[PDB]
C-alpha cells in the first residue's frame, strides 16, 4: 500500500559537475529498483551514489521496492560553470526557512560572496558561508543569485526563481 519516496542527500537539487550526490529510496526481500528518465538502471541497493556528476546525470529519478509503489519523480539538475547558487526547492510556504548555498566548482577558493535578491545585495560574507532566512516572508520572492571571488576572477551565478506561497 505505501508509496516510495526518493531522498536527495544533500538536499540541493541543482549541483555542479564532478559533485557527489546520494539518492535514497524510502519504504520497506530487501531490494530496490531505480529509474532514470523512465529507464531502469542496474543499481538495486537502497541508495544510489553519484561520485562525480555529469550533465547527463540530470533529469528525474524514481524508485520502488517490493513493499512500496512507484515514487513521484524527483528532478536533478547538474549545471556547468564555476559558481552555482544551491537551493533545496524553488517554491516555499510562508514562514518556512530558506537555506541557500553559494558553491564553487570542486569547492575552489571562494571568497567575498554576495547573495542578491532582485539585483540587490542581501548578505555579504568574507569567506563562503550559507545564506539563511529563518521564516520566509512574502517579500522574499524573486530571482536569487550569488557572486564571489572564485580564485582570481569575479563570477556571478545563474538565476534561481524563488516563490513564496501562502495557503
Amino acid at each position, epitope marked *: 500500500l505505501p508509496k516510495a519516496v526518493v531522498f536527495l542527500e544533500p*538536499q540541493w537539487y541543482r549541483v555542479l559537475e564532478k559533485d557527489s550526490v546520494t539518492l535514497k529510496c524510502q519504504g520497506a526481500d530487501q531490494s530496490t529498483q531505480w529509474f532514470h528518465n523512465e529507464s531502469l538502471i542496474s543499481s538495486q541497493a537502497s541508495s544510489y551514489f553519484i561520485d562525480a556528476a555529469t550533465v547527463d546525470d540530470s533529469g528525474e529519478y524514481r524508485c520502488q521496492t517490493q513493499l512500496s509503489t512507484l515514487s513521484d519523480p524527483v528532478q536533478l539538475e547538474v549545471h556547468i560553470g564555476w559558481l552555482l547558487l544551491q537551493a*533545496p526547492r524553488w517554491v516555499f510556504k510562508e514562514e518556512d526557512p530558506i537555506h541557500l548555498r553559494c558553491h564553487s566548482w570542486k569547492n575552489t577558493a571562494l571568497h567575498k560572496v554576495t547573495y542578491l535578491q532582485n539585483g540587490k545585495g542581501r548578505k555579504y560574507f568574507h569567506h563562503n558561508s550559507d545564506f539563511y532566512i529563518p521564516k520566509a516572508t512574502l517579500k522574499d520572492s524573486g530571482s536569487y543569485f550569488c557572486r564571489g571571488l572564485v580564485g582570481s576572477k569575479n563570477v556571478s551565478s545563474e538565476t534561481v526563481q524563488i516563490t513564496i506561497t501562502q495557503g
Partner: antibody
Amino acid sequence: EVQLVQSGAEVKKPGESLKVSCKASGYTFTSYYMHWVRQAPGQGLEWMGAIEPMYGSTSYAQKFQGRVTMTRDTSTSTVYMELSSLRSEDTAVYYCARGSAYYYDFADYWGQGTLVTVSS
Amino acid sequence: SYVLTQPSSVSVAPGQTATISCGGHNIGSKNVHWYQQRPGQSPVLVIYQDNKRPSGIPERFSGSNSGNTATLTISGTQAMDEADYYCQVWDNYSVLFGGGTKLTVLR
C-alpha cells in the same frame, strides 16, 4: 541511533589551550552542522559557534571570535573545537550539538559534554 | 546584540500546569526552541519552531510564540519535569540562549 561521543575530561592551567573532539555517528556527517555550547558551573548554556562540515565554513559568537577555532575531519566524522588563552572563567562543560535540518537554527542532538577545569 | 529574557524560577504544584516565558523584541518574528536540562545531564530538545514536538516527548509539552513572549507549557507536571529550561533563537547568523528557568515543585 544518532550518537555524539565527546572526548574525556581535561585539566588546564591559565594561559594554555583546550582542544575537544566530537565523534558523530548514525547519520550522514556532512549533511548536518555541528554546534559547540559551553556551560559554566551553575550557569546557563552559552553558544560558541558552529561549523559546516561539508566545506568547513564556520560561524562564531563575538565573545569567542579571535579565540575559538573549529575544524572537522570528514573521513573520521569528527568535529574539533579549540579555545586559546584559557582563564579560570573558561571552566565549563563543553557540549557539541548536531544542527537540525541541514542548518544550525537549532540543535536536535547533544553530546555527553566534556569537563574542562582551568585552574592553577 | 539580541536579548532573550527568562524568569529565574517557576513554581508549580504536582499535577498542575506550569508556564515558562521567554521575552524578546518582536520574538514572534522568530521560531523559538526550548531545551530541558536536568541537573547533571545534557540538554534535551523538547519544542522546536514555536510549537512542534520531537518524537518521544509527551504531548503535555506545548509551545506558543506570539508577540514579544514565547511560552513553554507543561500540563500535569511531575517530579521528572524538575529541571532548567532554556529558550533559543537564531539571530543574524548566531544562536542565542535565554537565562534559563528553574522549575520548582511546591509542597
